[PDB]
Design a protein around this ligand. Structure first.
Ligand SMILES: *[C@@H]1O[C@H](CO)[C@@H](O)[C@H](O)[C@H]1NC(C)=O
Ligand SMILES: *[C@@H]1O[C@H](CO)[C@@H](O)[C@H](O)[C@H]1NC(C)=O
Lengths: 171, 204, 169, 206
């Protein structure tokens, strides 16, 4: 039957949080392009390795339906990571502090939300995600570029997540 | 004092076994005088603003603080206003009017879950509570290895019935407890109680 | 997107089922109580007793963007509402079982009517009951029951498909 | 004179996307005559509010104001929370029964932006986008239209998408002018309907 280890109300709220955050990052990316003509993340590609911008994988999602402890676990680690990267940007600058703060609270709660659900259903690993290695962002420019990059990665991460979740919503 | 006060926590459940809407309330202060409760009602439309046909009063039995409206008096799948009135030799009181469709408050009983008739596996089967078989239902099945740490594992949005349902991933104890409960799909209704625990053994 | 609110269609589908279960109860009772078990055997009497088949002129979507299909569903239910009333209870052993089926059919017809009014889809000419076949003798009432129950049943099987489509849960 | 506080009732909350804060209002009952104080208290919980999670900062009410607002910075959206109000008077205390909601389940929606289109007889073309602050929410809309006449009857269209670039509505022959309105609601999750948008008075073709 259309059984699933995850409630549907929860999955729909996750999909809504994904869209909300996707709209927050878009605002951030718009601001950075308007305020600092930093508009194409591709141009900044190489600074990801240089700055150490972590990547959050989702290897465990297109291959499971009634057994998904690993999938939620990754979704969480990822959101948790970007929650840290956005914090590391120390607000980027006064002009961007507000826009970025919205993005970071929204990402933090989505991550929290996912954790508490995992606990409720009995999935929460004893091991809390050892917060990923956080980047430096030593100058104004590093923070501005870092922002464009982090936003770009968050974006890619959420597009995949959206597909994974959209799928689970109809089992 | 002796004036009857306005009753509260009025609820009604549609009983499919007796095919009657059963309503119960809270009278409150035990007055020392010959009082009486009458479950009054009238057919209406959504939001209960249209005072429609009066439904025969249901006079509560002597001790019991509840009355049952037989289905011959209800119009199922349409809203109705219900309230209870207390008549005492020193005054009257009424409860706030409740607005329901008897079919929205159907009292469900748990589904018939059984082991059917592979390593670390179990096969189940379930049919719904017969009197409600006409209702499209959705169910949750919960299972746990019977151990000192009671941790419930859930399966959601299961169909009302399954001929054979293979469940696996059961090796954390030799025996597991299983229960299932159901609720009306897509329309108003309350969850049914969880079925009595089934204690089954996963194939070795 | 539809001209009808999903909650209405979903309640319609449930009433159909409730009613299909009521008719089965009826047919079980008639088979248990009077060994009248196979409607096929009585087929020929649909003539003698004058028991009509409620028409459902393929109502997926007609000259009406739904105004009409509901109109037919209502006419049919309305008809069986009458046929079942003409059986004057069949007999004391069956009165209860039939009364349940009758009430459930009446309400379903009512419910559909009121929805149609709310949407302004109600037929302009309100239904006047047709010529109701008389069920003179006990046997005519017993066989009539099996037959009406059998027609109502076929009427609801089609109605379920029609409504199940309009819905798509 | 002076009487002790009555337990507050009709407590409700609505999530305001404009201000990004949960606003709760209640009914204090009978005046007490004493300098009385109300504090909206709450804690994060889980569904059914059995779980006693973290304490959210008390929200104290301005004098004579029978409402308090909890800022977003204090809310954990998409998780349930228990909320109740407490009346403290010099002669006693009372509390309202606890309410259990997820701020996002009581979002207050404003109607969609419905406009006519600047382009066979009896046709109209429409376009609608949802209320911007709520664009991230999947919504479902109902559109109602009627010819301007002697006690016109509303004709409805249900389960419409949240936005449409161009939506052709035809067969409108009863009058030279029709009124149209549209309202939306959160799709598949808890939410109230938005108010109907202000009537559009459009002339069909011919
Ligand atoms: C209301 O009545 C029900 C059913 O008798 C009872 O279980 C519940 O505790 C009561 N709740 C309140 C608030 O009185
Ligand atoms: C409950 O309180 C709200 C807010 O004051 C009010 O709008 C609502 O109408 C009240 N309930 C009723 C039935 O009036």
């Amino acid at each position: 039957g259309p059984a699933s280890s995850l409630p549907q109300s929860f999955l729909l709220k996750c999909l809504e949080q994904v869209r909300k955050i996707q709209g927050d990052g878009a605002a951030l990316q718009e601001k950075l392009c308007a305020t600092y003509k930093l508009c194409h993340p591709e141009e900044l590609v190489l600074l990801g390795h240089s700055l150490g911008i972590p990547w959050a994988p989702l290897s465990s999602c297109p291959s499971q339906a009634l057994q998904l402890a690993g999938c939620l676990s990754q979704l969480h680690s990822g959101l948790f990571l970007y929650q840290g990267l956005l914090q590391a940007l120390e607000g980027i600058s006064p002009e961007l502090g507000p826009t970025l703060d919205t993005l970071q609270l929204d990402v933090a709660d989505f991550a929290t939300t996912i954790w508490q659900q995992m606990e409720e259903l009995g999935m929460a690993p004893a091991l809390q995600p050892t917060q990923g290695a956080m980047p430096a962002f030593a100058s104004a420019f590093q923070r501005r570029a870092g922002g464009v990059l982090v936003a770009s990665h968050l974006q890619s991460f959420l597009e995949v997540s959206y597909r994974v979740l959209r799928h689970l919503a109809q089992p | 004092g002796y004036p009857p006060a306005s009753p509260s926590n009025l609820s009604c459940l549609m009983h499919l076994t007796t095919n009657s809407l059963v309503c119960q309330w809270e009278p409150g202060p035990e007055t020392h005088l010959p009082t009486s409760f009458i479950l009054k009602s009238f057919r209406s439309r959504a939001d209960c603003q249209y005072q429609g046909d009066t439904i025969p009063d249901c006079v509560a039995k002597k001790r019991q603080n509840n009355c049952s409206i037989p289905r011959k008096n209800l119009l199922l799948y349409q809203y109705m206003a219900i309230w209870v009135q207390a008549e005492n030799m020193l005054g009257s009181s009424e409860s706030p009017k409740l607005c329901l469709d008897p079919m929205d408050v159907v009292k469900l009983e748990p589904p018939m879950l059984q082991a059917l008739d592979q390593p670390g596996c179990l096969w189940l089967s379930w049919k719904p509570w017969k009197p409600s078989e006409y209702m499209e239902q959705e169910c949750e099945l919960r299972y746990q290895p019977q151990l000192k740490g009671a941790n419930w594992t859930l399966v959601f949005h299961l169909p009302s019935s399954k001929d054979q349902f293979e469940l696996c991933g059961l090796h954390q104890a030799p025996v597991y407890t299983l229960q299932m409960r159901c609720i009306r799909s897509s329309l108003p209704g309350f969850w049914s109680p969880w079925s009595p625990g089934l204690q089954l053994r996963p194939t070795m």
